[PDB]
């Protein structure tokens with residue numbers, strides 16, 4: 001039975017509003033309702049992995065697991081295996097996979113981050129799960145960020161705290177946060193970003209939604225605007241939104257948005273908003289295609305509607321050769337020519353590079369680069385032709401061209417990372433000097449760039 005080169009992944013996010021679900025929620029797992037929906041002809045085809053994020057979840061883990069498993073069994077006639085479940089307060093993540101994947105999944109990690117301080121510590125934060133699927137690392141983050149139309153900056157801060165402190169994936173990747181640890185990272189939840197229009201425009205917004213005219217609302221969506229200004233979710237993707245705002249509804253219908261200020265809302269307006277979102281970030285040149293992104297129409301227990309997204313994701317096999325794993329394959333090498341880092345820093349320490357990849361036996365430290373002054377005030381760290389020759393464990397191009405090199409640029413003085421990025425080995429040619437590039441981030445903010453040339457030697 002051959003190893004897959006593609007899997008499909010279901011991502012669900014639902015703020016349950018502290019209410020039990022209705023008896024039928026199959027529409028969610030079938031990607032049926034509004035937006036980019038799944039074709040009817042696929043309804044019996046199981047996804048490989050289902051990742052369910054809930055917020056304001058009033059159920060026990062046992063209660064929700066029974067509903068989820070019985071839901072998927074009704075749809076697919078398959079009894080899914082539980083990979084992981086993790087709850088922080090009323091924020092929960094469940095990972096279910098087809099039984100045939102049980103011996104393809106390993107290195108399961110779970111963690112949570114609590115956001116805020118004092119007042120603002122106690123119900124917001126994130127849960128996450130990571131694991132290996134054969135040769136491919138997968139990470140999943142469900143976050144419930146700070147609420148309220150006037151707190152977009154707090155939401156951005158919550159995002160930076162979650163990506164700094166959530167401890168998932170390979171702990172040997174010590175310079176790298178979750179935004180660099182996974183082949184594919186999915187980040188979803190009640191992100192709580194709002195449509196930033198005046199309160200007086202509530203009925204106008206409702207009108208627009210009834211006409212399915214979302215353009216003038218999406219142009220004021222705080223997540224889209226904050227992402228365009230590079231304030232949050234830098235280098236993440238989101239599918240185009242073609243479904244109605246998923247918040248705030250009157251319960252037990254979808255006919256009414258409940259936006260007016262009430263004691264129960266702290267006297268805050270809740271204009272219709274896309275609170276409930278799915279974003280992703282995959283390593284460069286890895287296949288990832290969003291095949292659905294929408295909301296259900298028929299699950300009305302909460303003041304939020306469930307959101308679904310599905311993806312085709314490229315995966316690789318657990319490669320064995322005669323040589324690696326457990327030695328190098330001298331027929332393979334990675335060389336770097338004419339490389340330089342450009343850093344936004346005001347500092348003047350010397351810098352060196354670290355190269356991390358599962359195609360290496362362990363990470364590789366470079367020599368210090370040569371600091372020059374850039375013509376516009378920047379720091380340019382020149383490596384020229386000084387970078388070490390990297391020795392992969394396997395030389396077969398079917399393996400090596402699918403790999404990635406993570407780069408950290410570190411201060412000689414403190415050994416702290418000033419920037420992290422990633423280079424694909426999916427090159428146009430081998431034995432050929434070719435341009436490489438990655439932006440560099442630190443705590444998920446832009447700190448610079450790394451560029452130069454690469455020359456990859458494989459066994460072919």
Ligand SMILES: COC(=O)c1ccc(S)cc1
Nearest residue numbers: 108109167168169170171
């Ligand atoms: C800070 O340490 C980590 O990054 C980490 C990652 C994964 C697992 S399972 C455990 C710990």
